[PDB]
Amino acid sequence: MDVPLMELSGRAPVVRLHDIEADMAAATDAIRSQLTGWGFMAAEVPGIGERVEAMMNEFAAACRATGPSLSDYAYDVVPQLAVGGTHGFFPYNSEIPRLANGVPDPKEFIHVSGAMIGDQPPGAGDVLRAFPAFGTRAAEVFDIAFRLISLFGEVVRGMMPPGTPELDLSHDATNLRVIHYRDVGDREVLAHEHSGIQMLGLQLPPSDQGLQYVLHDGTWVEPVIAGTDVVLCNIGRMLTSASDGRFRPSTHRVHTKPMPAGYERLSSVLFAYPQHKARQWKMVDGELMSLNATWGDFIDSR
Numbered sequence: 001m002d003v004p005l006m007e008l009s010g011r012a013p014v015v016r017l018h019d020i021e022a023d024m025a026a027a028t029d030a031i032r033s034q035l036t037g038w039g040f041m042a043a044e045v046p047g048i049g050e051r052v053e054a055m056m057n058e059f060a061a062a063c064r065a066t067g068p069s070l071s072d073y074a075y076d077v078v079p080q081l082a083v084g085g086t087h088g089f090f091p092y093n094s095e096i097p098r099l100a101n102g103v104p105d106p107k108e109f110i111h112v113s114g115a116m117i118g119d120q121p122p123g124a125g126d127v128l129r130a131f132p133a134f135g136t137r138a139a140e141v142f143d144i145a146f147r148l149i150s151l152f153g154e155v156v157r158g159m160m161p162p163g164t165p166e167l168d169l170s171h172d173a174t175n176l177r178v179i180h181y182r183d184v185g186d187r188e189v190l191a192h193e194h195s196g197i198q199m200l201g202l203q204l205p206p207s208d209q210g211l212q213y214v215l216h217d218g219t220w221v222e223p224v225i226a227g228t229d230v231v232l233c234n235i236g237r238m239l240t241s242a243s244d245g246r247f248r249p250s251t252h253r254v255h256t257k258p259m260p261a262g263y264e265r266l267s268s269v270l271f272a273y274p275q276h277k278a279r280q281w282k283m284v285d286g287e288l289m290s291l292n293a294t295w296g297d298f299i300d301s302r
């Protein structure tokens with residue numbers, strides 16, 4: 001094939017959730033080598049695959065439900081933070097599609113923010129009350145993902161100059177995206193090459209192969225992650241900026257093969273953000289430069 005498989009199961013460092021700090025400390029030298037060698041990071045987290053599979057299966061069931069209805073919790077009827085991104089359900093619109101950088105987006109998806117988990121603003125939690133099986137599992141997977149991604153952030157911070165501050169990822173600003181690809185038709189590409197705007201992304205094991213990453217030399221590879229306990233950690237463009245371009249964004253894409261009549265591909269990813277209101281910073285010429293612009297301004301800039 002043009003794109004080789006990249007085996008990680010039995011190869012990436014093992015990080016037990018009941019043991020996450022000690023195991024991330026032990027894994028740190030290997031994870032640094034991944035970021036340097038590949039441009040993205042990986043850990044095997046025993047048991048995470050079945051927790052994520054269960055959560056995504058409840059999301060799929062919530063997408064098919066005829067009362068309550070996930071469409072009743074579309075982002076345009078969900079209370080939104082005054083300062084923040086948009087949480088709630090993003091329906092697939094077959095007449096005027098949502099565009100991902102100009103390209104129709106073949107999915108319906110939900111953003112479960114740390115704010116939403118806490119019912120912030122009041123009523124944002126309504127979807128988690130309407131679909132409690134999903135809601136409990138989404139909060140479970142959000143929390144596991146936020147603990148893992150926070151410790152990947154410490155690995156990256158550790159590689160940067162002394163004086164690099166804590167990334168200070170914001171629980172409430174951080175979003176778990178849960179995806180149900182649909183209306184795929186003859187598409188081979190579900191998502192063209194891109195990176196996340198935010199600090200870090202944590203790719204949880206998807207239902208199907210097809211997520212691909214580019215290596216430093218421009219070689220595209222396909223991590224073996226479907227059905228696994230492997231998580232991938234992505235550099236987002238806020239950290240590329242904070243690092244003065246040392247760590248490029250972990251550019252990736254999603255391809256697929258033909259699958260049965262409306263076979264349900266599912267995927268979930270944690271997007272970790274700092275506080276929108278907080279000032280930017282960058283490590284420039286070996287030490288911290290404080291910026292006037294905020295992390296919110298960074299997002300608005302694009």
Ligand SMILES: [Cl-]
Nearest residue numbers: 194195196201
């Ligand atoms: Cl992304």
Ligand SMILES: [Fe+2]
Nearest residue numbers: 194195196252
């Ligand atoms: Fe992505």
